Design an enzyme around this catalytic site. Structure first.
Site: not given
Lengths: 328, 328
Positions: B51-52, B83
């Site tokens: 996960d981010s 990101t």
């Protein structure tokens, strides 16, 4: 048109001595080194003269009492200040002086008014020109723009276009060579009043890959009253391969732990990612879309009168003076 | 044209569920869901799906060892990633694998592929188009631009134009629906060096008004091997009414104390102001114009090789892989 101009020092008042620029000049001097002949009732007063990076929280109290006594004496106030912490000063003043009756405008420059190709005169001219518009509130004027103080952020360390209005529109901008008011911030109520108070001991830490919660546990022991974590993007506190999230979970029940973002634009939204929801559930307070400088000074300001986590959380999420956009 | 696509995780491999976005898709499925042309040329491989915001330094070791072993078997490598930490990954990888023989591109998206108006397929197509241009190095492809990995920074937490090449120009951009190269980095040497070693325990602290050095002394005591102070503008350490300067003066002799800036553009210049020069005198290392991500990651990388201060100072000042600009 009675205008009062207070000096705090700053690049705008310096001169390249032996080891680089060092703030040196008086407000009257600077004032003359520009189009001061644009005759309107004016008056300078030096409150201080420090390089901005030396400014401390107390200086904001000093500056705010000053303004307070004079809000009835003049039609508008201009503050010359160093660009480095100007956004911090503007923000804290916005929390301390509620419903200002007159425009208070902070300004400075990237090069000493004592050089050419200097932005100083243009900036001062824009700041005076704005106070004539009678638009009250606390703003910063820089490179042809006037921005609400709590939304402004310094994003460039050298160029003339050093400030920007973050997540919120400019109030004024130069159009065909004349300040044009683009919109009037209408938070302000009628009754003016000061709420001069703050707890300055807060810690700001940037989250990076692998960061441990040790530094957060110890900031509590060292006596820090609040902790702001500058996160990656929209929001989340790592719990993979680190004890950071475990440590935040409990420290967050002792002192306010705020999560803001590294990104310059858009803010945080702890509902976006599941990792964000988990953080919200662990006691973390989201900073919405507030600038970094308003987040830091608003927490210091709130801690000026309470240590209660639920009340810090409610005040941080309430729009006090235009610093925050209505969240869903 | 043999392309390898390695998945690491992130929003691009996630689906918005009843708890916000969360990991859920493997690389093959992202490609299928993106409608990307085919897989007979393209080899899809999952390394992980995290996960981010949950990427940790050891994931970079895993990623670097994979790449190192495949650079001579494919003509290009695309990495799908979150990101939030993508710039740290591009940066670390650039120091770990110098002079790569093929283009290695990291990409992701602000919106999961299953959301309406997702940027995922476009970012994916852009990365694949850049990889066939055969321009070696490590890059981040995003919103139609390809930027040098070590010069990219995430400036938005929600907008599609989330990444920007800081103090350095884009390498490629979409023009007339086609990717046009704007300039080829040319600081690559002949030999492909593999240096997968680093010290992850460094700490980043923003400098704010009133900040004490107590937290800095505490970080040393805790085992931090380096410290980054995110300064105010061109650079300086506040020595007024605070013991921060005093503490940094002793700490900087035992571990490196790096000074960067809160501003995102233009960087640090420690010769410009008096405060800046006292900082250099005090033993602080300027980060010059490097991105925060490159700065953090390079410090970590250097500490994996030496603990010697002047040595750390020489390396931080050296342009290792295009991360920083000359005369500093």
């Amino acid at each position: 048109m009675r205008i009062l101009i207070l000096g705090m020092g700053g690049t705008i008042a310096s001169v390249k001595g032996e080891r680089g620029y060092e703030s040196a000049l008086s407000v009257s001097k600077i004032l003359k080194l520009a189009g001061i002949s644009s005759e309107a009732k004016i008056e300078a007063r030096d409150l201080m003269n420090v390089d901005s990076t030396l400014i401390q929280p107390s200086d904001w109290e000093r500056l705010a009492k000053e303004i307070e006594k004079e809000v009835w004496e003049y039609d508008g106030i201009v503050i010359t200040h160093g660009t480095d912490t100007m956004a911090y000063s503007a923000s804290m003043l916005s929390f301390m002086l509620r419903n200002p009756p007159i425009p208070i405008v902070l300004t400075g420059s990237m090069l000493p008014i004592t050089e050419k190709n200097s932005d100083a005169p243009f900036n001062l001219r824009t700041a005076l020109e704005f106070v004539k518009l009678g638009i009250r509130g606390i703003y910063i004027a820089f490179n042809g723009k006037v921005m609400l103080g709590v939304r402004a952020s310094k994003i460039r360390s050298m160029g003339f276009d050093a400030f920007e209005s973050i997540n919120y529109p400019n109030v004024a901008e130069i159009k065909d060579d004349k300040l044009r008011i683009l919109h009037i911030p209408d938070f302000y109520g009628d009754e003016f009043f000061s709420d001069i108070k703050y707890e300055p001991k807060v810690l700001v830490i940037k989250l990076i890959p692998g960061l441990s919660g040790d530094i957060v546990r110890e900031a509590l022991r060292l006596g820090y009253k609040g902790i702001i974590l500058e996160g990656y993007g929209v929001g989340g506190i790592p719990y993979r391969g680190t004890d950071l999230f475990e440590v935040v979970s409990s420290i967050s029940k002792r002192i306010p732990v705020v999560l803001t973002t590294q990104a310059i634009y858009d803010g945080v939204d702890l509902q976006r990612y599941k990792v964000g929801r988990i953080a919200l559930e662990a006691g973390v307070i989201p900073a919405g879309d507030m600038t970094k400088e308003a987040t830091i000074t608003k927490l210091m300001w709130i801690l000026g009168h309470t240590k209660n986590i639920e009340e810090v959380k409610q005040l941080m999420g309430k729009n006090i003076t235009g610093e925050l956009t209505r969240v869903s």
